[PDB]
Amino acid sequence: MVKLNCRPLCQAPTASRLVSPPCFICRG
Amino acid sequence: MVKLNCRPLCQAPTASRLVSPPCFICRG
Amino acid sequence: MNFNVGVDFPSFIAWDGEESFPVKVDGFNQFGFTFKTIAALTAATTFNIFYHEPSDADPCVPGPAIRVPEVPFCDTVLLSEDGLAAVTLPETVTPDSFCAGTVPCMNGQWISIAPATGSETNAANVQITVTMKGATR
Amino acid sequence: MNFNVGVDFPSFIAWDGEESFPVKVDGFNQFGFTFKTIAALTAATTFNIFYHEPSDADPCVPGPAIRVPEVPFCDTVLLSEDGLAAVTLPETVTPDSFCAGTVPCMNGQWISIAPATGSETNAANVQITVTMKGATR
Amino acid sequence: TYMKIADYGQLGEYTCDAKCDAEFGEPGNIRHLEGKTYDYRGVFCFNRKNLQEANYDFLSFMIGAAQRSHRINRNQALMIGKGVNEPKGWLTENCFPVFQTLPVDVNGTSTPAFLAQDWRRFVTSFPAEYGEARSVMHQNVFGYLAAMVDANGRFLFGDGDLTFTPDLVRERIRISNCLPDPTEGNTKGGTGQDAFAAGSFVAAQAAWKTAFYAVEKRPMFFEQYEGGSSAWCVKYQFGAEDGGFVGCCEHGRILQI
Amino acid sequence: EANYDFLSFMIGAAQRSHRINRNQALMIGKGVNEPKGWLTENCFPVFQTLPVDVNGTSTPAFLAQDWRRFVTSFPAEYGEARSVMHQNVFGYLAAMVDANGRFLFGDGDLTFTPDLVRERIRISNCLPDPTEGNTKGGTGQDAFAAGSFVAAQAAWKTAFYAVEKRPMFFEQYEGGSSAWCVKYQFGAEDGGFVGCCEHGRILQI
Amino acid sequence: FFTPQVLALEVDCNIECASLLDLYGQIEVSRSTF
Numbered sequence: 001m002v003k004l005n006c007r008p009l010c011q012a013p014t015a016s017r018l019v020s021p022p023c024f025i026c027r028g
Numbered sequence: 029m030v031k032l033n034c035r036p037l038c039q040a041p042t043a044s045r046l047v048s049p050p051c052f053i054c055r056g
Numbered sequence: 057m058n059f060n061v062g063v064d065f066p067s068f069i070a071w072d073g074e075e076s077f078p079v080k081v082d083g084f085n086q087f088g089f090t091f092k093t094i095a096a097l098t099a100a101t102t103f104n105i106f107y108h109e110p111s112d113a114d115p116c117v118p119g120p121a122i123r124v125p126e127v128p129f130c131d132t133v134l135l136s137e138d139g140l141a142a143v144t145l146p147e148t149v150t151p152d153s154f155c156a157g158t159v160p161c162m163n164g165q166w167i168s169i170a171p172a173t174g175s176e177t178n179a180a181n182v183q184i185t186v187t188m189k190g191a192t193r
Numbered sequence: 194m195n196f197n198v199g200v201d202f203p204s205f206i207a208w209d210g211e212e213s214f215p216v217k218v219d220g221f222n223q224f225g226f227t228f229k230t231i232a233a234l235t236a237a238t239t240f241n242i243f244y245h246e247p248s249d250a251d252p253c254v255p256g257p258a259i260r261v262p263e264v265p266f267c268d269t270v271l272l273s274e275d276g277l278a279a280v281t282l283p284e285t286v287t288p289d290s291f292c293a294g295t296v297p298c299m300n301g302q303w304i305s306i307a308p309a310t311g312s313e314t315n316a317a318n319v320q321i322t323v324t325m326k327g328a329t330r
Numbered sequence: 331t332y333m334k335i336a337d338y339g340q341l342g343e344y345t346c347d348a349k350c351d352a353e354f355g356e357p358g359n360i361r362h363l364e365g366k367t368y369d370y371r372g373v374f375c376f377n378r379k380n381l382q383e384a385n386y387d388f389l390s391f392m393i394g395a396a397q398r399s400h401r402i403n404r405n406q407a408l409m410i411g412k413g414v415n416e417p418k419g420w421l422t423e424n425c426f427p428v429f430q431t432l433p434v435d436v437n438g439t440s441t442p443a444f445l446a447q448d449w450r451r452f453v454t455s456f457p458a459e460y461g462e463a464r465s466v467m468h469q470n471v472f473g474y475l476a477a478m479v480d481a482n483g484r485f486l487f488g489d490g491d492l493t494f495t496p497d498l499v500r501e502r503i504r505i506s507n508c509l510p511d512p513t514e515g516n517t518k519g520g521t522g523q524d525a526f527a528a529g530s531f532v533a534a535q536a537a538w539k540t541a542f543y544a545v546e547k548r549p550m551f552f553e554q555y556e557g558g559s560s561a562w563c564v565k566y567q568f569g570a571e572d573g574g575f576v577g578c579c580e581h582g583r584i585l586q587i
Numbered sequence: 588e589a590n591y592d593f594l595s596f597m598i599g600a601a602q603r604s605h606r607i608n609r610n611q612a613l614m615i616g617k618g619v620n621e622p623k624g625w626l627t628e629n630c631f632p633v634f635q636t637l638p639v640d641v642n643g644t645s646t647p648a649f650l651a652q653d654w655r656r657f658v659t660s661f662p663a664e665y666g667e668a669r670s671v672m673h674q675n676v677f678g679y680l681a682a683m684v685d686a687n688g689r690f691l692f693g694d695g696d697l698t699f700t701p702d703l704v705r706e707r708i709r710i711s712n713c714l715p716d717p718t719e720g721n722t723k724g725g726t727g728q729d730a731f732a733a734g735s736f737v738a739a740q741a742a743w744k745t746a747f748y749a750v751e752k753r754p755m756f757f758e759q760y761e762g763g764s765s766a767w768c769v770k771y772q773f774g775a776e777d778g779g780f781v782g783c784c785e786h787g788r789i790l791q792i
Numbered sequence: 793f794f795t796p797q798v799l800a801l802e803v804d805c806n807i808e809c810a811s812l813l814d815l816y817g818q819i820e821v822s823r824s825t826f
Contacts, residue, residue: 021478022521024688025434026051027445028641028727029126029159030143032091033200033359036153037217038253038330042427043586047725048447049682052650053641057366059326059794062225062293067204067322069229077320080289088198092205116289130768131354152253156199183206185322189198201362219413222366252424300414327331327364327796329575332800333591338600342773344612344621352772358600360591364796429722447682450690450697454678455721457712459807475697480688487695501698543800578805603808610809613816669815711810743815750819750826776824782817 064191071103071169071184078108078118078166085190087167091145091155095181102144102175103184105159108166118166127161142172145182208240208306208321215245215255215303216323223326225295226280226306230288231318238312238319239281244301258305264298279309282319334361367547368416370400371569373555378564393552396568400550408544408574409508417574420542421531421584425576428584430529442526442587444471444512444519446478446486452585453502453535460537460581465502467533468511472503474519502535509533512587529587536582544574598757601773605755611713613749613779622779625747626715626736630781633789635734647733647792648726651683651691657790658740665742665786671709672738673716679725714739717792734792741787752776 068079073094081087108118126141136142141159149155167186171179205216207226218224241260248256263276273279278296286292296304304323308316336359343353374392381388410419420426431448433440456463476494478486488494498505512518512530519526536542548571558565615624625631634657639648661668681699683691693699703709717737724730741747753776760770819826 016515017517017520017524019517019520019524021474021519022443023479024445024481024684025436027048027432027434027447028050029141030157031197032143032145032155032157033197034091034149034153034155035200036150037220038152039425040253041424042429044427044429044720044723045730046429046431046448046451047722047727047730048445048451049679049684049725050727051684051686053639055637055639055650058223058225058295058297058299060225060293060295061202061223061324061326062227062295065198065202065204065324065326066227066291066293067324068227068291069206069209069320069322072206072209086195086198088195088200088202090199090203090205130770133354154199154203154205156197156203158195158197158199160195162195185204185206187198187202187204187324189196189202222364222413298415327366329363329365331796331798332803335802335804335806337806338596338603340608341597341601341604343608344616346620352774355601355604357593357597360596362590363800365800447684451678451682451722453698454681455675457807458674459712459810482687486688487697489695496697540803545799577803580805607808610812614812671812671815709810709812709815711812712807713809714812744817746816748817748819749813750821752821752824779816 065187065189067185067187070167070186071171071179071182073180073183076168076170078121078168079186080118080166081162081188082165083190083193084188085192087158087162087186087188089143089155089157089169090185090187091157092183093145093149093151093153093181094183095151097145097147097149097181098178100144100147100175101178101182102172103142103169103179104172105141105143106168106170107162107164108168109164118168121168121170122164124159124163127159129160143169144172151181202324202326204322204324207304207323208308208316208319210317210320213305213307215305217303218299218323218325219302220330221325221328224304225293225324227322227324228282228292228294229320229322230282230286231320232288234282234284234286234315234318236312236315237281237283238315239279239309240312240316240321241307241309242278242280242296243305243307245303245305247302255303258307259301261296261298261300261304264296266297281309331362331364334363335359336361365545365573365575367545367571367573369569369571370403371567372396373558373565373567375558375563375565378562381564396552397550400570404572405508417544418576420576420579420582421534423576423579425579426534426536426582426584427580428531428586430586433587436521441521442528442530443521444474444526444532444585444587446475448585449475449533452583456535456583463502463535463537463582464504465533465535466504466506466509468507468509468513469505470511470513470516471532472498472505473516474513526587532585532587534582534584538582541577541579541581542574543577544572546572548572601757602755605775609777613747614714622749622777623781625781625784628781628784630784631739631741631787631789632785633791635791636737646728647731649679649731649737649792651680654680654738654790657738657788661740661788666744667707668740668742668787669707669709670738670740671711671714673714673718674710674712675716675718675721676738677708677710678721679718732792737790737792739787739789743787745782746784746786747779747781749779750777752778 069077105124106121107124111117111119124141125139126136169184206214207216243258244261246256248254261278263278265272306321338358339356341355407416410421411417434443510531512526512532550570552568555565555567612621615626616622636649638645681692715736717735718725719732724732755775757773760772764770
């Protein structure tokens with residue numbers, strides 16, 4: 001049939017939000 | 029002459045609240 | 057790759073909650089018991105064991121229901137006041153827990169279990185069947 | 194000297210003649226069906242096989258009844274409709290002479306058997322049980 | 331198949347003295363068990379024309395793909411695979427003791443948190459009578475542990491060198507990336523909407539040398555599947571088979587939320 | 588004909604029941620035809636904790652400060668007094684936090700593992716765990732039980748004594764053992780008592 | 793009809809207590825009373 005390869009170009013970027021432990025709030 | 033050895037089917041969750049020493053408030 | 061584990065160890069309905077069924081064990085040499093609950097129990101339940109002989113009218117149908125006598129092992133601490141074999145399921149058996157049992161002394165050709173009187177309402181929520189082991193023919 | 198084969202090959206009620214019952218197999222690795230006739234039938238009786246999955250509400254309660262598919266093999270040249278796993282006990286079947294079977298490919302958590310459309314009235318006089326083997330848990 | 335010692339019932343209690351006789355205690359069990367293996371095979375077809383007059387080789391690429399896919403699929407099934415036609419994954423049986431942490435409220439919102447209190451409590455809540463038992467988790471959650479801060483602002487681990495470098499392993503920590511890494515990427519520890527997720531697996535800690543086993547019988551085999559080849563195609567066939575199973579899910583504990 | 592061997596299995600089970608029953612009796616034995624358990628002896632110096640308050644709702648609580656006070660409050664002239672407690676208590680202690688966020692013990696090591704021999708502390712996982720099992724009953728609210736055995740400490744070389752007379756003996760019961768049956772019998776000889784319940788403290792809630 | 797063959801062997805998964813015996817005083821009486 002037709003393998004139909006694409007290879008997009010735009011490549012538009014990523015947005016990892018690199019979160020990290022918040023401040024220690026008392027339990028209860 | 030019962031001799032009724034037995035077992036159940038699949039067991040069930042084990043979620044024990046992992047409570048932990050809270051913040052030291054103040055004796056006073 | 058489950059083998060056809062029905063051609064040997066064939067199971068048969070013994071007590072479907074409200075009806076017993078005599079089962080022939082002559083073709084076999086060993087047979088156990090399998091108990092199951094379908095709902096929550098209220099009190100402990102009791103069952104009496106019966107056996108049947110070839111009826112004189114037909115050599116391949118069960119006869120009457122003769123009570124099975126209990127045979128004591130060693131280290132026995134209690135014997136039924138009648139001396140007849142019987143079983144009982146204790147209270148607090150959740151209906152997801154199979155139960156096993158076996159009488160070590162057989163007699164007759166057919167076996168049967170019946171809910172002992174007074175403990176038959178809960179028997180509705182109880183199912184009993186039996187498998188075998190031998191070929192012998 | 195019949196060993197207690199309740200444990201080590203237990204069994205359960207699969208089809209009493211009035212309604213089906215899910216029988217868990219996940220705790221085991223081998224299993225099979227044993228059929229038995231309370232009397233002679235009128236025509237060939239066919240049965241559909243179903244398997245289930247643990248309900249999202251609880252991992253130990255029967256969910257929907259998924260239709261297990263038929264799986265052929267080397268000498269299977271009679272592929273039926275939509276490749277569903279279904280069996281059929283023929284006529285000329287008597288009591289005191291049982292039949293057995295099992296599904297070659299397993300999937301799901303517990304199995305169930307239902308009277309395929311057209312055999313219900315006749316299936317009302319058949320008893321189906323399941324025997325397991327190789328429990329690992 | 332193999333035996334499984336269930337328990338050792340009580341035999342002798344502490345008796346009185348007006349008894350020349352004695353007392354019978356009930357015995358335990360031997361609880362025999364069985365188990366099986368599982369298969370893994372497949373095929374592919376090439377076009378002899380494409381294969382021969384090509385830019386370069388494709389076959390060895392496919393063989394390496396076979397080996398790597400086999401290894402990674404075996405590992406992932408060993409982790410999470412179901413019992414149906416596969417070895418049962420120890421993570422899915424839900425009979426290992428799995429705990430979860432209370433959600434710290436944030437002025438009105440009880441919110442998921444892998445508070446260092448919970449981790450230190452878990453690692454020290456394990457019967458040492460079972461011997462040592464190693465823990466496993468994802469690298470992302472480990473780095474999350476390394477980044478925990480106090481109410482002041484100081485680091486909670488290695489304050490003053492900007493790198494925690496905690497000398498792992500030497501204390502029970504074996505980092506893998508096959509685990510479901512409760513930090514989605516590195517975006518799940520968000521006290522705000524980014525909260526780590528209702529009931530998500532965090533880490534594990536077990537004595538694996540007796541908690542789980544893997545049985546190995548058949549290595550990889552590759553045959554030229556004659557009968558599918560048509561002098562215009564070629565079809566190879568391969569296979570390998572093995573299995574795995576939990577030993578006893580009481581030699582290891584699991585974390586969740 | 589058995590596939591397994593019941594004999595050695597029964598022997599091991601009997602020795603195990605011997606050991607575990609001896610320990611459980613020596614600890615909580617109810618006097619009659621058995622050594623009186625020094626836990627139930629109930630003359631041993633004991634001290635409760637303080638009704639710590641939070642949200643103007645007092646709750647039984649317990650701090651490392653109270654623990655150190657209980658440890659150092661011993662009459663040292665009595666001699667060295669080993670302390671004992673469940674492992675879950677050790678977990679509770681190694682997981683104490685200040686008002687800032689720092690660990691009260693081993694700050695910045697992910698654990699707290701000293702050698703519990705110079706620390707004069709020992710663990711028995713069946714010593715009644717003060718926590719209702721680990722964690723579940725632990726602290727704060729809906730947890731942390733009340734008037735419960737937290738820990739013990741004593742000069743056990745003079746606080747409690749154990750007497751040993753005869754080890755385990757096993758023999759085939761000749762009487763009653765026919766050619767169709769067979770029966771075995773066994774026994775031992777042990778006991779214990781409390782020396783003087785003035786050599787050790789108890790920490791309770 | 794096939795024969796499953798033996799393997800594994802000795803999953804036990806059973807625990808005990810500690811040993812709070814050496815701390816107590818040891819006495820070895822020969823008779824039954826003291």
